[PDB]
Design a protein around this nucleic acid. Structure first.
Ligand SMILES: Nc1nc2c(ncn2[C@H]2C[C@H](O)[C@@H](COP(=O)(O)NP(=O)(O)OP(=O)(O)O)O2)c(=O)[nH]1
Ligand SMILES: [Mn+2]
Ligand SMILES: [Mn+2]
Length: 430
DNA sequence: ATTATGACGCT
DNA sequence: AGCGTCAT
């Protein structure tokens, strides 16, 4: 009872940009705004592969991983923007720079953890304590939460979406105890006020809209963020977890969408996250290992301890290209030329990183895939990265992979390469 | 012939 | 160190 810690110590937010690459292209080209729009990589094969989709286009069934030609079948007026091509490959620099814009705004409010190109976690615990001090026990007006949903409300005792949103927010605010500066529900609420301000700042200063989740840990904040996209934020309280999880497929929780989640379902004979509560911690550890078992035991009760890492910058800088089917690299000249192309992009990005961020990478990782191997990587080899020079990096990458070529002929490469990947790692302050 | 990235756990 | 998983 009283000693049963409930995982309510922290206020954590997850901010995710809506259809990010599409918004980057819509800002640059106003003709794409408020239209069914998607971003594609390449064009020759089936129109290019879609990697981002505006919400207008999603209404027609357009999705990521779809070929543009098939997307056009579902939505003939779909507009398309293509990723830049440089040195023969897709170049994502425009989106990385737009990402830095958003991350720097978020960092004004709190230290953030960059989780991907378009989303970051925020630990708002201290910021919430400060705003609570300033409030002096003043209640929180619904006017301060103009885009916030309270998951699970309204309940009990109505036709429009905004009306439902405001109804739930009213029930939530009416139930709040604002004289208690340590009430977790109040703390989450103040956290949501701050996230409204953060999202207002992002849209004002970049033009980009985003959604957000506010809860007590990273997994619940991420799940909350997805409940009311786009351009809205969602508060998931500790109390909302039993009902939320009672019908939540296990695969919806981050890290359970793959083989481990399928094994949870198959071994335990369950479907929903809430069903996990009926097992003891030792039972879960016996099936899924000590770490996973402890994590599942806490997480099905809404509890997770993973910290928001103080990290605004990526830990690695990498360059990769697939060479599918008949485009696979089958000569040594080919392999050297593409290693050089990747290495020149890497050099450019690394040099800009050293200038911006006062650090230098010290290890080069070379990954290849060989024809007939279904795995992502057929082989990974590291070597030293001592100079930001593309010719040196590509020569070293060739040296560490050249023993892969089973061809007796010096010129041919067998079996052909269907992927090259260069990744700079192990940064040190410079 | 999804592709181009990341992060992180395991041994 | 090199490999596998998860994401998207
Ligand atoms: N190169 C590449 N980029 C990708 C891929 N998948 C996603 N991206 C890029 C394109 C995406 O714009 C961006 C962010 O990924 P999300 O947050 O998963 N999707 P979004 O922000 O579009 O929509 P939502 O409103 O549902 O959050 O990453 C991929 O497979 N390859
Ligand atoms: Mn997004
Ligand atoms: Mn994202």
């Amino acid at each position: 009872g009283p000693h049963m810690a409930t995982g309510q110590d922290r206020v954590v937010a997850l901010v995710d940009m809506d259809c990010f690459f599409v918004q980057v292209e819509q800002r640059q080209n106003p003709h794409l705004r408020n239209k069914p729009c998607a971003v594609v990589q390449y064009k020759s094969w089936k129109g290019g592969g879609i990697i981002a989709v505006s919400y207008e286009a999603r209404a027609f069934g357009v999705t990521r991983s779809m070929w543009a030609d098939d997307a056009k079948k579902l939505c003939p007026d779909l507009l398309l923007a293509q990723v830049r091509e440089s040195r023969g490959k897709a170049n994502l620099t425009k989106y990385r720079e737009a990402s830095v814009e958003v991350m720097e705004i978020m960092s004004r409010f709190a230290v953030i953890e960059r989780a991907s190109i378009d989303e970051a976690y925020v630990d708002l615990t201290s910021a919430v304590q400060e705003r609570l001090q300033k409030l002096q026990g003043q209640p929180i007006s619904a006017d301060l939460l103009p885009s916030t949903y309270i998951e699970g409300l309204p309940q009990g005792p109505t036709v429009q979406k905004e009306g439902m949103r405001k109804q739930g927010l009213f029930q939530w605010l009416d139930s709040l105890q604002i004289d208690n500066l340590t009430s977790p529900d109040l703390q989450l609420t103040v956290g949501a006020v701050i996230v409204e301000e953060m999202r207002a700042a992002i849209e004002r200063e970049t033009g980009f809209q985003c959604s957000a989740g506010i809860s007590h840990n990273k997994v619940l904040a991420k799940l909350a963020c997805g409940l009311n996209k786009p351009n809205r934020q969602t508060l998931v309280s500790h109390g909302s977890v039993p009902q939320l999880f009672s019908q939540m497929p296990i695969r919806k929780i981050r890290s359970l969408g793959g083989k481990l989640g399928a094994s949870v379902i198959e071994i335990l004979g369950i479907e929903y996250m809430g069903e996990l509560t009926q097992f003891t911690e030792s039972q879960l550890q016996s099936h899924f290992g000590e770490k996973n078992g402890s994590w599942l035991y806490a997480m099905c009760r809404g509890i997770e301890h993973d910290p928001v890492k103080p990290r605004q910058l990526p830990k690695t800088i990498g360059c990769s290209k697939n060479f599918p089917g008949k485009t696979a690299l089958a000569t040594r000249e080919q392999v050297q030329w593409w290693l050089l192309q990747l290495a020149q992009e890497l050099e450019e990005r690394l040099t800009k990183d050293r200038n911006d961020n006062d650090r230098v990478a010290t290890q080069l990782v070379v990954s290849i895939r060989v024809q007939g191997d279904k795995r992502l990587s057929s082989l990974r080899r590291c070597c030293a990265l001592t100079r930001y020079d593309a010719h040196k990096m590509s020569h070293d990458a060739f040296t560490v992979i050249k023993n892969c070529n089973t061809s007796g002929i010096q010129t041919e490469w067998s079996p052909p390469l269907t992927m090259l990947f260069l990744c700079a790692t192990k940064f040190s302050a410079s």
